[PDB]
Structure formats: structure tokens, C-alpha cells
Amino acid sequence: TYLEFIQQNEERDGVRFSWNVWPSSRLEATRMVVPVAALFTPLKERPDLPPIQYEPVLCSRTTCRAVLNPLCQVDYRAKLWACNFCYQRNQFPPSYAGISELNQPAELLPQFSSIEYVVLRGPQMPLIFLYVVDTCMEDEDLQALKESMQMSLSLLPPTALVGLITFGRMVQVHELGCEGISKSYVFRGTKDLSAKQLQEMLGPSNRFLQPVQKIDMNLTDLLGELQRDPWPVPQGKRPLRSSGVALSIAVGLLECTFPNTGARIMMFIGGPATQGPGMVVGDELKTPIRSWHDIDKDNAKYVKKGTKHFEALANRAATTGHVIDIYACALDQTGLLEMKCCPNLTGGYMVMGDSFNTSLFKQTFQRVFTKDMHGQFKMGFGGTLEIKTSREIKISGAIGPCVSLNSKGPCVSENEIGTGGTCQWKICGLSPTTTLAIYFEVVGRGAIQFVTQYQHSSGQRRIRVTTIARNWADAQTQIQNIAASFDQEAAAILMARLAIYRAETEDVLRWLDRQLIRLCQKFGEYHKDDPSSFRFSETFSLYPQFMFHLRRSSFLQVFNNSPDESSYYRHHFMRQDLTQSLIMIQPILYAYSFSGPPEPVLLDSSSILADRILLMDTFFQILIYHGETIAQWRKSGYQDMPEYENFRHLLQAPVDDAQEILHSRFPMPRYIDTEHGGSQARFLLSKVNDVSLQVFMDHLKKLAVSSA
Template sequence: MATFPEYIAQNEERDGVRFSWNVWPSSRLEATRMVVPVAALFTPLKERPDLPPIQYEPVLCSRATCRAVLNPLCQVDYRAKLWACNFCYQRNQFPPSYAGISEVNQPAELLPQFSTIEYVVQRGPQMPLVFLYVVDTCMEDEDLQALKESLQMSLSLLPPTALVGLITFGRMVQVHELGCEGISKSYVFRGTKDLNAKQLQEMLGLTKPSATQGRGPQTAQQPLSNRFLQPVQKIDMNLTDLLGELQRDPWPVTQGKRPLRSLGVAMSIAVGLLECTFPNTGARIMTFIGGPATQGPGMVVGDELKTPIRSWHDIEKDNAKFMKKATKHYESLANRASTNGHIIDIYACALDQTGLLEMKCCANYTGGYMVMADSFNTSLFKQTFQRVFTKDVQGSFKMAFAATLEVKTSREIKVSGAIGPCVSLNAKGPCVSENEIGTGGTCQWKICGLDPSTTLALYFEVVNQHNAPIPQGGRGAIQFVTQYQHSSGQRRIRVTTTARNWADAQTQIQSIAASFDQEAAAILMARLAVYRAETEEGPDVLRWLDRQLIRLVRGPGLKPGSGLRGSETDFMFHLRRSPFLQVFNNSPDESSYYRHQFNRQDLTQALIMIQPVLYAYSFNGPPEPVLLDSSSILPDRILLMDTFFQILIYHGETVAQWRKAGYQDMPEYENFKHLLQAPVDDAQELLHTRFPMPRYIDTEHGGSQARFLLSKVNPSQTHNNMYAWGQVRPSP
């Protein structure tokens, strides 16, 4: 038997699942004493190079309330060609295509190594990919130029059959017609009046695509609706020229005023346009914003520069007069987009806030990206935007569209809810718990946008009664069924079936305690805390977290002293101080951005976000991880800190002096040159792979940006107990 850490790593690698407990308490009463619920971090599209998609459709259980997919945990009678569902125990006949199966000739879905398997749905039309650019033109020429170049670059990365549309906005909103040769033609809308989908349909002369009219570029007769959404291969030159000719918004901006920016109406038109033409098809609305919305529905600040955009203090004092109305506007757009399977991405590049707090639901409900930078001219934006179009080894985009996730469970356990970039599909079923956590009351969720790192936290409730023992050796099973539109246009279904042993907490407490996955549990509790922080007062959330921590340290309802170890309480210390729970020193937009990233990233990235990783480089040997503590800052060391959002290189006092003296340029100090280069090379590797690209900071002892390091380390040494960095005051 492998050790629990090996077992956990193997399951994560194969199925993209990490459970808080890997042996489950067998009754509701025992489960509630455990503090941390039975919960899982699930990455639906975890990259598996050894998982070729199967070219037939899954076999389903015939019971209408179950419909679980045939999997390796089912009992099979090869002679009678029957299989028993491991969720509802229904006996099912195999379809005729399985006539040749036997113990030695098994289909892939019955082999244990295929606990995760992917099917290609053969029926139904191939869907085109749709990309609709919504571009702010109220920005400085330099910024607009950089954005135009990035957009032109992205056209060359799109597949030739992808459909593209363009909406630009300033004081007015322009929907560009892309089908006309030689002239640029657009429909102009007032930025102060919202339109519903029906009005938009009439004004733009759109017709709903009928069922007979094939969607997209593969039909000989182009549907009328495609005047605004055209295949890249047809309008590549036209659109490149059109983007190149984009000018700043021509409306004059008087001294002391902000430009009038009709962002709310532009997004509403974008959602309406896709709603009329491509409902229930994968599509991305990519919104590029250079400042806050200042007029019309969705405005977050007035046009007077002397009135600053709302701060946390204003929100507390109920002094943010546009906030509630704007949030309501963007929430209704997010709900409309998620109903139709459309993704809304937000790229906000400005020095001041742009209203991400009000708009966060657009990206959070639809699984869209949220990227925040100072300017469209920074490598942070350019590289991140380019990474959106990364391709896998088969040459397909690493993005999936219009996905649904369904969870099926054994009778003894039910699903309480999910936390992540998803919305509820309100599917009631036998495996839905009455106790809701996060987005609950359903066993199905819609995730409009998915990529290989998108991770959901799913919470379960053990419902088995204390007086109804589960037979010895019994196992609880959970099946995750993810249906999605692959970037090649195919519909695919990925099925992950996983099981864990039940144990009686009275007699097998040791095995339950040994199965605790501290890392997964910490992130699952952190997601709960962040979810609560969005709706409750900060101090209340911290008090709740402290109570949970005290119960955990005492021992999660197990035996005295079986609680968290020091390193995990350390982790909670960093969580309490993190920007996910503390809003001090962060603007409302920054808090929304940090929380958005935390709620969609996988376990490894989430751990780094809460407890940054610190590496020390010195002449004493290879780089080594060191404690995130002020005692790690020594004069003859270089430190590399990765907080996920920032990559920071810090040169100790002595190293900084040597660097200033130029020792690295002298041939006899070759080893010093290598020492300086080592952290830079490691930082570059992180900068090249991370999404979104982190901010890169190079600083030294006494430098102004050293504050980023000092704010993260545990202040075990302060001016009261420190003689010099890393030295203890000598005794007299």
C-alpha cells in the first residue's frame, strides 16, 4: 500500500482531484465533529497527455434519476452482458456494440487506470469559436496604439474559421459591420440608454438563426446575423486595417473632467448581439478598459475629476452612490451571458481604479479572465493577453467553452455546493444536500469558460445516520461529469469517477486522521473564508476563521493532539494577513482582482498566493527554500520571493554594495556574476509560464520596493529585538 501522500499525489495527477479527507467518517454526527467538511478541489480539464479522447459516446445508467456513466467501480456480469450501477445499484443491459466484451477484452471505461476518461460526442453540428472585441477608445494615444497592436497580433493567432466582431466605445458605442469591402460602416448607439436584446435585434436588422441555418462559416449561404461576426479568413485584412485606423474618442474632454465612457451600454450591446445570433454556443466577449465608466447604466464614478472613485471607507459609510446600481447592471449582464454560455473577459489597464468591484460578477459567473495592469503598453498586459491564445500539442487552444459540471454521489453522501467561476443550473436531484455551501441547492453548474488550471471547490455532506452502519470495506463514490465545447468545435464529455473508504470514527480514528490532506483542507477552508468575505463584514469572517482554527488545532474531533501541525497554523497566519481577507492598503478593485484569481486557480498556485515561496541564493551552495520570516533576510544573501502576483528579487546589504562596486564585471569574481544571474534566470522561468503574468520587482536592502518583501515576511525580528539584520544583540 502506498503512503497517503503518494496516494494523494497519484490521484491528483490522474484525476485532478484533491480531497480534504481521504478516508471518510461513516456518519453525519462524526463528520460534523471534523471541523473541515468532506470536500474536494477539482480541476475538470487537468492536462493529461496520456488521455486520448474516445470516439464513441458514454454508456449511462437506465434509471432516470441517476444516469451515472459506466466506470471502473461498476460490477459487471460478462456472461449476461449486464452491469450494476455503483451509485443506485440498478442493473443495466450493455448496448449491442458491447457484445464482444469479456474479462480479457474490456472497454477502456472499465479499466482502473481510466478513472478519468474523455468521450467525443459525434452528433450535433460543429460550433465555430466566436470572439467579440469590446474596445475602449478613451485613452492616451500611446496606450491605444499598444492595444491596437496586441489586437492585430491576436487575429493572427485565431483559427481561420473563428468568427470575430468589433465594438468600440467612448461617449457613443459603435458596432462595426465587417462584411463591407472598401468602406468602414458602423451602427452608432447613445451611451446613456440601455437596450434589451429585442430592441437591438430590430435596430441592427438581425434575425434569429433558424435551426436549418447552419451556424458559422461552414454554410454556403452566410446567415444574415453574420454581418457583425465574420470568419477571420474572410476579413483578416479588413479588420487589421480597421483596428489600425482606430482613433481616440473625438468628444472633447474639458479641463478637470474625466472622458465620458459608456462601458455599461457597450457591454450590454455585446451581450445582446451574441444573445441574438449565437445563443448556447461558446463565445468570448473580450473587454478592454482604460478607465472607469462615467456615464449611462453601469457608471461607477461621475465625470468630475475632483470626486474620486469610491474607496473601502466610502463603501463602509454607504457613501458610494453609484455602486449598488452599477453592480446590479453588471450582474444582470453576467446572468444573461452565463445563461447563453458566453464568457466575459475584462482587461483593465489604468493607474486608477476602473470599477472591477462592480464588474467582478461578469468574469466570476462566466469563467472569464480578469487582468489588471497599469497600462496596455506594459509587458504584463501584452504577454498575458498573448498567453490567452496558448495552444496544446495538438494545436488546439487551451480553452473550453460552454461547459456544465454534474456531480453524482453514493447514497451516504450529498453535495452541498461549489465555490469557483460557475453559476447554478438549479438541478435538484437525489444527491443534493439541504445544507448549502457556496453556490448550492443543485448538482449541476455551468462554467462558461474553462482552462487546464480552472479549479472548483466542491463541498459534501455525509448524510448517513449514526445508527445505520456502513458495511466493513464499504466505499463512497463520487462522479464528476464535465460536458464542454472543445476549441476544435467538438462537444466532449470528460468523466472522473473516484471512491474513498468509509471508516467508523469510534474504532478507526487513526486511519481517518492519517488521511487528512492538510494542503487541500487549508485551501478549501480559505475558499470558504474568501466566499464569506464577499458578503460579510471583515472582522466577522476573521472571527469565524479563528474559531475554526482553534477547533482544528485541538484536533478535528479526533483524539487530543491530532490537530494541525505548526506549519499549517503558520499558513493560517498568512491567510489572515492576506489581501483576500484584509482590505487595508488595497483598493476595492484590487481586492476583487485578488479574490477572483484565488477562486479559480489550482491548489499549488493558491498555496503560493497565501504563503509566498522564498528562496535564498548564497555562496554556500545551491538555492534553498527558506522560511518566510524576517530572520531569512541576511546581508550576504539574494532572496527570490514568489507571491503569484509578484516575482521579487531582493539583494542583501553586502551583495547590493558589491553589485554597486561592479565586482560582477571583474574576471576574478566570475562566481559573483553567476550568483547574481541565478535568481534572474529562475524568475524568468516563472514569468514565462504564469498566467496572468506577475509583476517583476528587482530591489535591494534599503530600496523603496523592499517594502513588498517586508510586508510579507513574518516579523519575528523588529526594531525592539534586532541588533542588525539577522544578528542577535551580543550580551554585555
């Protein structure tokens, strides 16, 4: 089954292609409506694969150097293996002198396509965690924040190095365990510093970055004694917050102390930066922070210069191999639009909320440090991703959390998409859910090898190798075999990645439509000029619907959202795996009522019954809706009566299923309990339903059966 194939391959190799059968001719390659692309999860978890403490074994043809894989033709007699990428024949390294047929190296069994190696030769560098904290916020929020930080400190590895930087009007770089005093270096938040400058003004581990085991007690006390920015805030003014400079100093500090080694710069902000570089809004309360509307009518004088400042910091950090996290909680906007690149370019996180003093933030924050079956963090640092393809395959680029190493070669395409012009990318921070989109081009069995070198949370350097192969289309059945290998879900997401990438770097809908229509005409079924005749196989029938929801989503229709919310939504969409991505675009909906157990139902107004309870899973929100009738039976009180122990199983069935997923998901989703009449019902109402899908479909058919 084509479905079993798609499933088993994503499970084993953490990969999903828009097409599982590729064009064997130039006349087809160029006429591909949806590009051959893959959604790749370099660190996907699976059934405990045995880590290979090896010397991976590389091909001996200078240019190639691919890793020995299951696609390689071996010869246990001649102690030789022929590379599958360049046909170069190799001699087996000494440590393999005794490998036999009835006992061969794991990297050759088709089961271990996608395998991990550990490279042990040089002492491991400790992890580094630098807390960068805003102190311009209400006491309840600050106290809550201080507690979350102290907690995270109790989870760090003994050897990890930690540093603390606090800010408000001035920026303070604390020197921990300085004894009998507690000193820091204060800088004006008014002007930026390079790193050379910083290095000079300030002076393994430094005075500013010490091992947790030696410094933890002192830092806990310091974190506990932190107080509000001392500078008063006059009437009608926002406090002066130097977020831009605080971040440049954090980046600069690590750049001149530990460049090129895993590190985490965690910034906690409680309001917009109000004193550039990086300024997002003035200090007059009477003037609101920019809205999308304000941006479109050129009434946001800070956006561009502010965006420029953070983009530079992002690239400085990403270049030095450091990760930047932004935890932003405030009642008003915080400037995530201008700072997005830091967490987007580096694989850092973006957490948004209303206050640090909520369960939402506290739980999301502690999820950050979730550990595995060995007591180790589920994070990887300084990841280098290199892709090797058959001479017939080229790479247009990638879309997701990464930066280009701008390394050239024959695999690089002229038609670049996203971060292109390279066959190597750097991902400063990644996890088991991190997902990149790789767009390919054809210029049987084509092969692609993904090699990911990263620093494990334990300190070990690791190399993840996933080698995959897909059949070349048979010449006497090209489009027929190709069509059968379509992965509509994967393709819908890959196309959505491109569209969102173009919008966040400016009509994109028109491009989306032209491609939708083209796909309908090439793989559909119909009689010219007869809309009613149009049909799609089981392989393509859901694509139109996914497209409908995507173009109406908050990912493309930004107004009705604050610029910060929009940036948050996209940030998470550009890193997520297939399952979660689909949910973001088209929320799953479950119905609950006495008449049968919970069931999935169409995202339509027709599913909103009065005697039923609905659960909507937006990746960002889990919402429970109580229909008018059940709202009454519930306002009435029948729930308590011992007579209605049934009305209880009902009222809590959705609450039960919510909890489960309301925990596995990293950014903990916001939970909402509303009903017919409630104001929060609006969330379900706007996700439900040109106009409706029926009208959208008719138009698509009217254009599918007409002129090409």
C-alpha cells in the first residue's frame, strides 16, 4: 500500500516527499506542478536504534565522501564496497578486516538506513546557558519569572556553564560568585557594542560563565533577589527598555568567549524595546505600538531599522553557532515582528503569553528542559546538515530554521528557493521535532543522503545519517506512476512553506491558485467545459480542501491579528512536522454527545449542534464548545445530580482528551471553555465552514475544465 509506504518511511527515516516516484525525463522534470521536495526531521525519535560508536566509514573519492549505506554494493570476498553515489570503489578500513556475510556492519542493513554514530576523540565542551532578563515589569510577573528561572537552574547539567544578564534602562552583566559583594558591569542601553569592544571593557569557564555545580547556590540567591528596574516611570510613559542592546551584549559576550560551541541565549521580555538600537516604539503611552494596518499605511517609523538591528544579531549568533530564545509575556505587543529572525535563523524558541505568572508560561517553560530515558535534554546544538544526491538530482534550497554555509558543488541548483545556493546548512539549535523543507530538482532508484553532525546535550559529537531511495519513473508509464506516488498532505505543507516564505519576504494567493488549477488539469479527470465531470483520485482529493483552509488561514491573512501573533504562528509552522502542520492549517474537530462515543467531524457550521459538545484542536488552541442545549443542561445543574452520572461522563469527556495532548505539545496550547453565546466561541466560528468550500470548489472546477 502507498499509504503504508509513506507511513513506514516517515517512521524509519523521519522524511516525507511530495512525490515518491520521480520524473525520469527532462520533459517531465520541468513540467512538475508541485516540486519534488521533502519534509525532513533530522532527529526524529524511534524504537531505540543502537548508537554506532564508530568511524562512520566514508567513500574514498575526495569530492563525494558519502557515508557507507545500505544502497552500497559490497563484496565480502574482495573486501570492497562500491559507492552508490559516484561508483567509486573503496577498500574496507582496518577495523572492518573481519566483517563477514553472516555478520555485517549495521549501516548496511536496510533497517538501519538512517542511523546515528558517536564520534569520540576530543574532550567535550560543556553546554552554555545565558539568561538575559528584563526587569521592567510588574512584581507578580517578575516574581513568577524569577521562580521559573530558579527552577530551570535545578535541571541543568553539573558541568553546564551559566551566565546572567539583566536589564531595564541599563544593561548589567553579572559576575557570579564574586564573594561578599555581588558585582556586575553596567552599560548604557543607549548604544551598541561590537564584541571586541565588549571583550576589552570586560577583560573552561569565565568570570561571567561558570559551571552550574560550583555556581548554582549563588545564582539561585541572586535570581531570588532580583528586583524591578530602579528607574521610576513618569506618568503616561512606558519604562525605558533596552532589549536591543541587552541582546547585542549577550551575543557579543558569547562570541568573544566561546565561539563555535553549543550555547543558549534565553531572553525574557515583558514589554517592547523602547530605546533603540532595536527600538520598537517610543515611550509615550498615548502612542500605540504598530498594528498591521499601521505598517501598511507607513505609520510605523521603527519597524525597519529595528528589524535590521535584530537580523544582524541573528546572523552574528547563527554564524558563531549560538541559539537565541525569546520568552515574551506582556499584556501588549512585545516586538516579536522585529526580533523574529533571532529565533527563526538560529533554531531558538519563541514563547508568547500574557503574563509570566500563568500556568501556560510556567508549564511551557519547564517543557523546554524535558529529559529523555537517560536524564538528558532533548536538544542538540551546532548542527551541520549536508545533503548528497545522485548526479541527476540538485537542491534548490531549504525552508526552515537554518542558515546557509554557502558551500558550492554540483548538487547546487541555479533555481534557488528559500535559503539556497548550498548543499550545507547550519542549525544552531534543534530537537526531535525540528523539521526542514528541502526542495529538489531533477537535471531506477534516485538517492539522497542526509548527514547531520551536531553536539548532543551530553556533550558527545554525533553524526546522524539517513539515506533514502525512490524509483525513477518508468518511461512507458511516467505520469501514471508519478501520480500514484503523490503525498497530498506532504505536498500541501511543502507548498504552504513556499507561500508563507514568500509572504514573510514580499499576490501569493494567485501563485497558490495557478498551481492548484494546474494540478487539477494535469492529474484530474474531466470533459472540457463540463465542471460537473471533474473528479480527483483518492490520491489527490484532499488537496483542494487543504488549499482552501491554507489561503484563509491566519498564516496568510494577517489582518485581524497583531503583527506579533502573526510572526509567532509562522515561526511554529516553519519548524513543525507533518502531523502538527496539518492541524495548524485545518483544525481537527471532535463531537461529543450521548448518541455514541467521540467522533471526528467536518470543520463546518453544520457540525455545530445544540445537544453536542465540540473539541477543536488548533495547534495553538484546544477549545471546548458547549452547544446551547448542553449549555442549558449545564447552566441548570443536572451535572451534580446522582441521576445524571451520564451527563458527567459527557461534560468531562472533552476535558479528559484535552489534558493528554495539552501536555505532549511543546508550546502548551491555550485552553478555552466556551459555549453558544459565549464571546470566546468566535474562535470556533472563524475556523469553521472566496467564500465557503462549496463555492470555492465550484470555481476551481469551472477553471479546471476550461482553458489551460
